Symmetry: C2
Subunit: 32 residues, 2 copies
């Protein structure tokens, strides 16, 4: 499992596996 | 995929697939 915290989109787009709003910014999780 | 940003550990432990330190917290990603 390799996932990472993105502040918006990541190179794959359709793979939003989680979200965390931290420091007023939305951190999406996209994982492979 | 269901992932979540945890500051320490999660119920699965070593499923840490990514990290992001934000606001002094280490956001470890573990996913299912």
């Amino acid at each position: 499992a390799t996932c990472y915290c993105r502040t918006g989109r990541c190179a794959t787009r359709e793979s939003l596996s989680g979200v965390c709003e931290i420091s007023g910014r939305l951190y999406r999780l996209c994982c492979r």
